[PDB]
């Protein structure tokens, strides 16, 4: 909140219930967001690339999934 | 000559190699020192 | 004794798009917030006067705030243990 | 720690500089934005919209990155590119001030 | 051997320098026997400015490459000749460049007479037509106003340029001095030859 110049947890923001111009909201990553993708050792210029985020809603999956053709960038 | 109290305690450790006196300050040719890779991601270096 | 003194300063602009609309008046407003009534550089700055020189509104590099700074060279009237214009204070003292 | 020793050989306020601007007929830098300059312009405008919010686009956009990118594409970016490689000991800064609304735009796609 | 190739290619070097020979060219036998006889050999040439440039070819086991006082006497009496003396040239064996006493004499003489330039070179700088070597691009000196306009276009100070030693073979063959600019047409595998301009810095000794 810019008016208070402090950060707030939404668990206690039930009564405010709204945002305003000049407010900063930290929101979860969604499909279509751009994410930096890196593999150590970072030897090449392409070792750090920006991919578009595809969020896998299945909770059983904890890996980073990327196309096999994309491995050549990271030598992975 | 039969006293064992004042013996060099480091002498009991019998040397295990040849050049334990040979000293040269050089980088270990297997040391990952100038490559900046974290401990857990050292598995990336594993061949296949 | 009151006198005219020329000062150098780099401002900080929190919203350069708003500020650059009326650059001169906005600059004088910022300066009278900043320097009027405070000791600074062996001087007290009683009153603000016209700006001799200014700079384009550069956007800060080393931070992502999108803010600008601008450099300003302005003349202002000052009230110049000899004397102690301790900076940041609204009164001098040479007791 | 022993430094392996080859032991090889070899007024704190700088004078102010006057910003001299090369006339538009003597500018030698390319009249097309580099992808670095275009990226910087889009980022600066997008952050400025993030902090201010005013816009000059007749089409509504829900994201500052899109508004800034389209402002760059439609040649109405309210930012000049100052290209500067010179500082003379004489205390003078020689820059070229380029209006991106007149420069060509790189691919960015 | 180094001496015969030196004998032909030194006159080639004077020809490249666009300088007219003063002394008549002796045959090879007389030159080689005189090198052991007198311990050196003197070649005189005149520039387009009409100033005298002298050259000294020293045998490896000559008189003046062994110690200091003899070397000092030779140069002191030679620079006492009534000549314009725009440049003077020494040619000595490659290890002789590492005999610090002789370089001390040459340095102190240069200090004694600063209005003219003294240089010392090994044989290999004159044992081939260096400009015609394949691996060596085409060096050429540009005039002061041309270099100055080049720098003014680029907003460059002369020291911001790449530096070339005055002891380089092609710069010596050009006759370049410190404070002069050399333009080089270097072959390129990315743009099919490209041109650079380098700043000549004092010779290494």
From TrEMBL, chain A:
<comment type="function">
    <text>DNA-dependent RNA polymerase catalyzes the transcription of DNA into RNA using the four ribonucleoside triphosphates as substrates.</text>
</comment>
<comment type="similarity">
    <text>Belongs to the RNA polymerase beta' chain family.</text>
</comment>
<comment type="function">
    <text>Catalytic component of the DNA-directed RNA polymerase (RNAP) that catalyzes the transcription in the cytoplasm of viral DNA into RNA using the four ribonucleoside triphosphates as substrates. Forms the polymerase active center together with RPB2. Part of the core element with the central large cleft, the clamp element that moves to open and close the cleft and the jaws that are thought to grab the incoming DNA template.</text>
</comment>
<comment type="subunit">
    <text>Part of the viral DNA-directed RNA polymerase that consists of 8 polII-like subunits (RPB1, RPB2, RPB3, RPB5, RPB6, RPB7, RPB9, RPB10), a capping enzyme and a termination factor.</text>
</comment>
<protein>
    <recommendedName>
        <fullName>DNA-directed RNA polymerase subunit</fullName>
    </recommendedName>
</protein>
TrEMBL record, chain B:
<protein>
    <submittedName>
        <fullName>M1249L</fullName>
    </submittedName>
</protein>
From TrEMBL, chain C:
<protein>
    <submittedName>
        <fullName>D339L</fullName>
    </submittedName>
</protein>
TrEMBL record, chain E:
<feature type="domain" description="RNA polymerase subunit H/Rpb5 C-terminal">
    <location>
        <begin position="128"/>
        <end position="200"/>
    </location>
</feature>
<comment type="function">
    <text>Component of the DNA-directed RNA polymerase (RNAP) that catalyzes the transcription in the cytoplasm of viral DNA into RNA using the four ribonucleoside triphosphates as substrates.</text>
</comment>
<dbReference type="GO" id="GO:0006366">
    <property type="term" value="P:transcription by RNA polymerase II"/>
</dbReference>
<keyword id="KW-0804">Transcription</keyword>
<dbReference type="Pfam" id="PF01191">
    <property type="entry name" value="RNA_pol_Rpb5_C"/>
</dbReference>
<dbReference type="GO" id="GO:0003899">
    <property type="term" value="F:DNA-directed RNA polymerase activity"/>
</dbReference>
<dbReference type="InterPro" id="IPR014381">
    <property type="entry name" value="Arch_Rpo5/euc_Rpb5"/>
</dbReference>
<protein>
    <recommendedName>
        <fullName>DNA-directed RNA polymerase RPB5 homolog</fullName>
    </recommendedName>
</protein>
<dbReference type="InterPro" id="IPR035913">
    <property type="entry name" value="RPB5-like_sf"/>
</dbReference>
<dbReference type="InterPro" id="IPR000783">
    <property type="entry name" value="RNA_pol_subH/Rpb5_C"/>
</dbReference>
<comment type="similarity">
    <text>Belongs to the archaeal RpoH/eukaryotic RPB5 RNA polymerase subunit family.</text>
</comment>
<dbReference type="GO" id="GO:0006362">
    <property type="term" value="P:transcription elongation by RNA polymerase I"/>
</dbReference>
